[PDB]
Amino acid sequence: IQNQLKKLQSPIILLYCTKEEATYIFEVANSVGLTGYGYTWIVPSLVAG
Amino acid sequence: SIGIAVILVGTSDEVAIKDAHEKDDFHHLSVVPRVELVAMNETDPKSIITRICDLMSDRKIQGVVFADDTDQEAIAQILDFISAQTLTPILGIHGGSSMIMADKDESSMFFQFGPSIEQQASVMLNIMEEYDWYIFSIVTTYFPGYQDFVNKIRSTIENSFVGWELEEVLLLDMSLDDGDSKIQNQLKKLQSPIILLYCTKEEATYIFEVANSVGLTGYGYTWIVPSLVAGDTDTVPSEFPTGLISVSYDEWDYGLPARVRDGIAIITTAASDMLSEHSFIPEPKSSCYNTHEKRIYQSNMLNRYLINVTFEGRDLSFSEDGYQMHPKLVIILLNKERKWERVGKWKDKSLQMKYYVWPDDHLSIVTL
Amino acid sequence: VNIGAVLSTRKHEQMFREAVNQANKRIQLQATSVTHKPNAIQMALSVCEDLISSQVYAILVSHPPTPNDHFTPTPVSYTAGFYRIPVLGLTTRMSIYSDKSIHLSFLRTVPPYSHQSSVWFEMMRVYNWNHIILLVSDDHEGRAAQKRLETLLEERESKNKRGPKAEKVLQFDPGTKNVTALLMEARELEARVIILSASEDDAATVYRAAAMLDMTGSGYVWLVGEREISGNALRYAPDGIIGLQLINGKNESAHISDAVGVVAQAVHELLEKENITDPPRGCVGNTNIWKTGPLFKRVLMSSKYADGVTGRVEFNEDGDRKFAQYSIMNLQNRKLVQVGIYNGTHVIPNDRKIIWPGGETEKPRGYQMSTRLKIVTIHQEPFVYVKPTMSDGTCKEEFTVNGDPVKKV
Amino acid sequence: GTQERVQNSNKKEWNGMMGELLSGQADMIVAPLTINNERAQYIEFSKPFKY
Numbered sequence: 001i002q003n004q005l006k007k008l009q010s011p012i013i014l015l016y017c018t019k020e021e022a023t024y025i026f027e028v029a030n031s032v033g034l035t036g037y038g039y040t041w042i043v044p045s046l047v048a049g
Numbered sequence: 050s051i052g053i054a055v056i057l058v059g060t061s062d063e064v065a066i067k068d069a070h071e072k073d074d075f076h077h078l079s080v081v082p083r084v085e086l087v088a089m090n091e092t093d094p095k096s097i098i099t100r101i102c103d104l105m106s107d108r109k110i111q112g113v114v115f116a117d118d119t120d121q122e123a124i125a126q127i128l129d130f131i132s133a134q135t136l137t138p139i140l141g142i143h144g145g146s147s148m149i150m151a152d153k154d155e156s157s158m159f160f161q162f163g164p165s166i167e168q169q170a171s172v173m174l175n176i177m178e179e180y181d182w183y184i185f186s187i188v189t190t191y192f193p194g195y196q197d198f199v200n201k202i203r204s205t206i207e208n209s210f211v212g213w214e215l216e217e218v219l220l221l222d223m224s225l226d227d228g229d230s231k232i233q234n235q236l237k238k239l240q241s242p243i244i245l246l247y248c249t250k251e252e253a254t255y256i257f258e259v260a261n262s263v264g265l266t267g268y269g270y271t272w273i274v275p276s277l278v279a280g281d282t283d284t285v286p287s288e289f290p291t292g293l294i295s296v297s298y299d300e301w302d303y304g305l306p307a308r309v310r311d312g313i314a315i316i317t318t319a320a321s322d323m324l325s326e327h328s329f330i331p332e333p334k335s336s337c338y339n340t341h342e343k344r345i346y347q348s349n350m351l352n353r354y355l356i357n358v359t360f361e362g363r364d365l366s367f368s369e370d371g372y373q374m375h376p377k378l379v380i381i382l383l384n385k386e387r388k389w390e391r392v393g394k395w396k397d398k399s400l401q402m403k404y405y406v407w408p409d410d411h412l413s414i415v416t417l
Numbered sequence: 418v419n420i421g422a423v424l425s426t427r428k429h430e431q432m433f434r435e436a437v438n439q440a441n442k443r444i445q446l447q448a449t450s451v452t453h454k455p456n457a458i459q460m461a462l463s464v465c466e467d468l469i470s471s472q473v474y475a476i477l478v479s480h481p482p483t484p485n486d487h488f489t490p491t492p493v494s495y496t497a498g499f500y501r502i503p504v505l506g507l508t509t510r511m512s513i514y515s516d517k518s519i520h521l522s523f524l525r526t527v528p529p530y531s532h533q534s535s536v537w538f539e540m541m542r543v544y545n546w547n548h549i550i551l552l553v554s555d556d557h558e559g560r561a562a563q564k565r566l567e568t569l570l571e572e573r574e575s576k577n578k579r580g581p582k583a584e585k586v587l588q589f590d591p592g593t594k595n596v597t598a599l600l601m602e603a604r605e606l607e608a609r610v611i612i613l614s615a616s617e618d619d620a621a622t623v624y625r626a627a628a629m630l631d632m633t634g635s636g637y638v639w640l641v642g643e644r645e646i647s648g649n650a651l652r653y654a655p656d657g658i659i660g661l662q663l664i665n666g667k668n669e670s671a672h673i674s675d676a677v678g679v680v681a682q683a684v685h686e687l688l689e690k691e692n693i694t695d696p697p698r699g700c701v702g703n704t705n706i707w708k709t710g711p712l713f714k715r716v717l718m719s720s721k722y723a724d725g726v727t728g729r730v731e732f733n734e735d736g737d738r739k740f741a742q743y744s745i746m747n748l749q750n751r752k753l754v755q756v757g758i759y760n761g762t763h764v765i766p767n768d769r770k771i772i773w774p775g776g777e778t779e780k781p782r783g784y785q786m787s788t789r790l791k792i793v794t795i796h797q798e799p800f801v802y803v804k805p806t807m808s809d810g811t812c813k814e815e816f817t818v819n820g821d822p823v824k825k826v
Numbered sequence: 827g828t829q830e831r832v833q834n835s836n837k838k839e840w841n842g843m844m845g846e847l848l849s850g851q852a853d854m855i856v857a858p859l860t861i862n863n864e865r866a867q868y869i870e871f872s873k874p875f876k877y
C-alpha cells in the first residue's frame with residue numbers, strides 16, 4: 001500500500017472499509033503524504049458513526 | 050644518461066620492464082632512461098617516502114612512474130605532496146582508484162590515467178544514441194561531479210538536433226537516509242526506460258535492493274553506471290540484476306607492460322623536447338630532507354611539454370586534470386552469469402558494436 | 418589516552434599539560450607533545466614515528482612562527498586522515514580546508530577569512546545602502562567569498578526597497594602593477610561603496626593606484642577584511658577606511674585551553690560510548706581505520722563546551738568556530754578607533770567618531786546617477802539611417818517635404 | 827542578439843546588442859528590438875511603442 005497509494009493525484013478521495021483497518025490506512029496515509037495539507041476525505045458514516 | 054625510476058605493487062611482471070625498454074624508439078631514447086624497479090609490499094606511505102627519496106638520491110632520479118594495485122586508493126594526495134616537495138613529475142599508471150580522483154593543486158605535476166567524469170558522460174550519451182534509446186532520468190548524491198555531471202549532460206541536451214527527454218534529476222542524500230521509506234516513495238516518480246546512477250559501491254547495493262521493491266528491475270528496463278561504482282573487481286553483490294552496462298577500459302586490457310612503455314615514452318620524450326628548446330633541466334632535487342628552495346631555483350615549466358606527446362604511433366594529450374585527452378574505452382555488460390563480457394569499443398568520438406539489438410509485444414513491420 | 422600537538426610555543430607544552438591536569442576532574446588522559454620542523458616532510462614522519470605509534474586518539478596543531486604558512490597544516494592534516502583520525506585546527510584561517518571532500522578529517526577552532534565577509538551583509542542595515550562593487554583575487558579565496566555573498570544576497574521572497582543588489586564584480590591576479598585599468602573602469606560606475614578581499618601586498622598596490630586616481634576622496638566607503646589593516650598596507654591605506662579584527666585571534670594559549678576543554682568534554686562523552694574500536698596501527702598496518710573517526714566527529718558535533726576565554730565556542734556544520742564575536746575599527750590618522758560592538762549577528766552600537774575619508778560626518782548614500790547614457794543602436798532602414806558626414810566633420814543639412822530641419826546626431 | 831553557448835564550456839553568452847547591454851558597454855537600447863520570452867528574462871521592457 002505504501003507504494004500503491006502514491007498513484008493518487010486528485011484532491012478528493014472516497015474510502016469504504018471497516019473501523020480498525022481504517023486507522024491502519026489513515027496511518028499509512030500519514031506517510032504517503034495524503035494529509036490535511038490541501039486534500040479532503042469523505043467516507044459514508046459506516047466506518048465511523 | 051638519466052634517472053627514470055619506476056615501481057609496482059603486488060605483481061611480478063619483471064621482464065615487462067626491460068622488454069618494453071628494448072622496444073624504445075631510437076629517435077626518442079636520446080636521454081636513455083636508466084630504468085630501475087623496486088617492489089615494496091604496498092605497506093607504508095612513510096615507506097613510500099623513504100624509498101622515493103632513497104632512489105632519488107641514489108640515481109638523481111628525475112621522475113618516477115608509480116604503480117598501484119589495491120582498490121583502496123585515496124593516496125594520490127601523498128604523491129601530490131611529494132610534487133609539492135620535489136619538482137619531479139609522477140604518473141599514477143594504474144591500480145585501484147589510483148587514476149581517478151579530482152585531487153586539484155597548482156604547483157603539482159601528478160597525472161592520472163583513464164578518463165574524466167566528462168568524457169565518460171559523453172561516451173555514455175553516444176552509446177545511448179546508437180541504440181535508439183531516447184528517454185532517461187538520473188540519480189545521484191554528493192559526489193564532486195554532481196552539479197558537474199548534471200550540467201555537463203544537460204548542456205549537450207540543450208543543443209538538441211535530435212529528440213531527447215530529461216524527466217528529472219534525482220538529488221539524494223548519501224549515508225543519511227535514516228528513513229528508507231523516503232526513497233521507497235521517491236523512486237516511484239521514474240517512468241523512463243533508461244536510468245543513470247552515480248554513487249559509492251555499498252549504497253549501490255542498498256539502492257539496488259530498494260529498486261527490487263519499487264519495481265525497477267530487469268523486466269524491460271536497463272541500467273548504466275559509469276564504472277566508478279563497480280569495476281574489474283567483479284565482486285557482484287546479489288542485488289545487481291543482469292544487464293548493467295558501463296565503460297571501464299581505463300586499465301582493463303591496456304597492458305601494464307604497455308603501460309610502463311607509454312610512461313617511459315612520454316617522460317623521456319618530454320625530456321627530449323626540453324633539451325630541444327635548449328631547456329634541458331638535468332638538475333634533480335638534492336635530498337628529500339633537504340629538497341628546500343635552497344636547491345629549488347626555477348619551477349617546472351616543462352609542463353609546457355608534458356601536456357601533449359606522441360610517439361610509437363600513439364598520441365597522449367592532457368587537460369588541467371591530467372587524464373589522457375583521447376582515451377580508448379570499451380563498453381561491457383552484466384550477463385546472467387554475473388560475468389563481465391566486453392560488448393563495444395569506443396574511440397575517437399566513434400563507436401563499434403556487434404549487436405544492433407538488446408534482448409509478446411514486439412513486432413516486425415514492412416512497408417514500401 | 419594520549420593526545421599530541423605540534424605547537425610553536427615550547428612553554429605551550431607545559432601549558433596544555435596543565436590543561437590536561439585541570440580537565441582531569443571530568444580515566445587516563447596522558448599528554449604527548451612535539452615541536453615543529455620546517456620541511457613538512459619531517460613533520461609528518463615525526464607524526465607517524467611518535468604520535469601515530471602511540472596509537473591512541475586525536476591531535477592538535479597551530480600556526481608555526483611562519484606568518485602565512487598556508488601549507489603548514491596540510492601534510493599532517495590528511496596524514497592521519499588516511500586513517501580517518503579527526504583532527505582539530507587552531508590558528509590557520511585559509512579557506513581551502515573548508516572543503517570536507519578532500520579533507521574529511523578536519524575541524525577547526527576559528528572561522529576562515531572568507532567566512533568573515535558574511536558580516537558585511539549587515540553594515541547597510543545601519544547605513545542604509547543597496548549598491549556595491551567587489552574586488553577579489555583570482556584564486557579560490559575570492560570565489561569562496563563570492564559564492565558566500567551571492568547566497569547571502571538570497572532574494573527575500575515577497576508577498577518597496579528589496580535588499581541590496583551586486584554590481585560588476587572584478588578580478589585580478591597577484592603581483593600585478595597596472596591594475597589601474599580596472600579602477601578607472603569602476604570609476605565610471607554608479608555607486609560609491611567598495612569591498613576588497615585579497616592578500617597584504619596587493620592591497621598596498623591598490624591603495625597606491627587608487628590614491629593616484631583620487632578615487633579615495635569624499636563620498637566613498639571601504640570595508641576590507643583582516644589582511645589589510647596589516648602594516649604593509651597600513652603604509653598605504655587612506656584614512657577613514659573601515660576594517661575589522663577577530664577578537665582574541667592572535668592569542669594562542671587561551672585557544673589552547675579552550676581546545677583542551679572541548680576535547681575533554683568530548684572524551685567524557687567518549688568514556689561511556691559503545692563499540693569502542695582500536696586506534697591506528699602505528700603507521701605500518703596501513704590498511705585499516707580506527708573505525709570511530711566518523712562517530713568521533715559526530716560526538717564532536719554538539720560538544721557544547723559552553724564557555725572558555727573567548728566565551729561560548731560552538732560549531733558550524735563544518736567543524737569551525739561558529740559564533741565568535743569580534744571588533745570593528747577605523748583608521749583615523751594612523752590611529753585605530755576601536756568599536757568592539759559585533760557580538761555575533763547582534764547589531765553593533767558603539768560610541769566614537771566615525772570619520773569617513775572625505776572628513777565629513779554624514780553617512781552618504783553612495784549613489785549618483787544622472788549622467789550620460791551610453792546608448793547603442795543597430796542600423797535598420799526606416800528607423801535609423803546611417804550616413805557619412807561631409808569633409809567638414811558634420812553631415813549636410815536637409816529639410817523635410819515641408820522643409821523642416823530633420824534633426825540628426 | 828541571441829543566447830548561445832560558447833568557449834566549448836558550460837557557458838552561454840549573448841553576442842549582439844544585448845551583450846553590450848549586460849556587460850556595461852551600454853545602458854539603454856533604442857532600436858527596432860523585438861520582444862520575446864528569453865530576452866524578457868534578463869532585461870526589463872518598457873511598454874511597447876509600435877504594435
Ligand SMILES: *[C@@H]1O[C@H](CO)[C@@H](O)[C@H](O)[C@H]1NC(C)=O
Pocket residue numbers: 357358359
Ligand atoms: C602540442 O601542442 C603544441 C601547441 O601547438 C605543439 O607543440 C604541437 O601542436 C603539439 N605537439 C606536437 C608534437 O605536435
Ligand SMILES: *[C@@H]1O[C@H](CO)[C@@H](O)[C@H](O)[C@H]1NC(C)=O
Pocket residue numbers: 594595596597
Ligand atoms: C601601468 O601602470 C601605470 C601606473 O603604475 C599606469 O599609468 C598605466 O596606465 C599602466 N598601463 C600601461 C600600459 O602602462
Ligand SMILES: *[C@@H]1O[C@H](CO)[C@@H](O)[C@H](O)[C@H]1NC(C)=O
Pocket residue numbers: 668669670671
Ligand atoms: C592571551 O592569553 C593569556 C593567557 O595566559 C592572557 O593572559 C592574555 O591577556 C591574552 N592576550 C594576550 C594578548 O596575550
